[PDB]
């Protein structure tokens, strides 16, 4: 999970 | 003929229309923006999904902010008279109101303005869909139980 | 008659105003995975706003972040439908  | 209703967009033009997918994965180093791992999965899912809706899909990868604007401009000036709708998917870093070309940001309003009812008459009265996978800020949702 | 130059747009945002949006490096983004699944299952059956409401529930209920960094762990996401459409939109026709 990574953020944009 | 009998009674008519017109509560739904006419979607039986000869073509469903364009689906432009802008998939930005790798950004210019000088921007400091990280590579968006997993976005190719999204781009492929979207391509197949909108292919099966009979959209003419165009995938575009790693576009600068200048290329994004020119592509939106060029696309807006195509003949949409035989197309039911228009779809644009933007995959990228973002902030509120903004999405990033590989080399810097683009105002969302600048992209969508090309398709305004008065500036793209082939699409007047037709649904223009913008689907946006990108940040709108830096808040985090902690959620609540059940 | 005229119509507003802003009418007939729909903005399907992946996340609420002001919020991060989550992307999984292996499965793709929460919102896009959910959107394609719901389009595949319901494009021949539901009007578009009702499809996008299923996407909202899918993202809201089925996803929660996992991070070694306490700041980013256990977070949630709600997408955000912004509609200036003047009619119902069905991707199929009669
Ligand atoms: Cl990827």
Chain C contact for B97 (CB, 8 A cutoff): no
B99 with B105: CB under 8 angstroms? yes
Q: Provide the number of CB pairs (under 8 Å) joining chain B to chain C.
A: 152
DSSP C88: B
CA neighbours closer than 13 Å in the CB half-sphere of residue B77? 5
Q: List phi, psi (to 5°) of B71.
A: -70, -45
On chain A, the residues whose CB falls within 8 A of the CB of C76 are none
DSSP string, chain B: -------B----SSB--EEEEEE-----GGGTPPP-TTHHHHHHHHHHHHHHTT-EEEEEES--HHHHHHHHHHHHTS--TTBS-EEEEEES-EETTEEEETTEEEEHHHHHHTT-TTT-GGGTTS-EEEEEES-S-SB-B-----
Å from C68 to nearest chain B CA?
15
* Separation of first and last alpha carbons in chain C: 29
Considering the candidates B19, B80, B88, B93, report the single residue annotated as catalytic: B93
Instruction: State which H helix or E strand residue C18 sits in.
Output: none
On chain B, the residues whose CB falls within 8 A of the CB of A4 are 36, 92-94, 133-135
Whose CA is closest to C18, among B90, B106, B98, A1?
B98
Structure-derived torsion over alpha carbons of residues C82, C85, C90, C91, reported in degrees to the nearest 10: -70
A3 with C67: CB under 8 angstroms? no
Q: Does the domain at residues B1-146 carry the CATH identifier 3.40.50.1460? A: yes
Residues in chain B: 146
Whose CA is closest to B37, among B25, B21, B28, B29?
B25
B134 with C32: CB under 8 angstroms? no
Angle of helix C48-62 relative to helix C30-42, nearest 10 degrees, comes to 140
Strand order across the B104-107 sheet = B94-95, B98-101, B104-107
**Domains detected in chain C:** 1-94 (3.30.70.1470)
CA neighbours closer than 13 Å in the CB half-sphere of residue B142? 3
Method: X-ray
Strand order across the B56-61 sheet = B56-61, B18-23, B86-91, B128-133, C9-13, C80-83
Q: Residue B93, exposed/middle/buried by CB under 10 A (0-12, 13-18, 19+)?
A: buried
Q: How many CB atoms are closer than 10 A to CB C85?
A: 17
CB contact under 8 A, C87 and B16: no
The domain locations on chain B are 1-146
């Amino acid at each position: 999970d990574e953020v944009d | 003929s009998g009674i008519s209703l017109d509560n739904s967009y006419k979607m039986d033009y000869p073509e469903m229309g364009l689906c432009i997918i802008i998939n930005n994965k790798n950004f210019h180093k000088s921007t400091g923006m990280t590579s968006r791992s997993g976005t190719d999965v999204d781009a492929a899912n979207l391509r197949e999904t909108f292919r099966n809706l009979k959209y003419e899909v165009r995938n575009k990868n790693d576009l600068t902010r200048e290329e994004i604007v020119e592509l939106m401009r060029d696309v807006s000036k195509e003949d949409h008279s035989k197309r039911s709708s228009f779809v644009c998917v933007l995959l990228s870093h973002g902030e509120e109101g903004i999405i990033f070309g590989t080399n810097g940001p683009v105002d969302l309003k600048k992209i969508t303005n090309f398709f305004r009812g008065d500036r793209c008459r082939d699409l007047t009265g037709k649904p223009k869909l913008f689907i946006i996978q990108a940040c709108r800020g830096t808040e985090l949702d902690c959620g609540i139980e059940t | 008659h005229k119509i507003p130059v802003e009418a007939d747009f729909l903005y399907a945002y992946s996340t609420a105003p002001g919020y991060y949006s989550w992307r999984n490096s292996k499965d793709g983004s929460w919102f896009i995975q959910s959107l394609c699944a719901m389009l595949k299952q319901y494009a021949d059956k539901l009007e578009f706003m009702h499809i996008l409401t299923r996407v909202n529930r899918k993202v809201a209920t089925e996803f929660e972040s996992f991070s070694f960094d306490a700041t980013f762990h256990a977070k949630k996401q709600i997408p955000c439908i912004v509609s200036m459409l003047t009619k119902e939109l069905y991707f199929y026709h009669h």
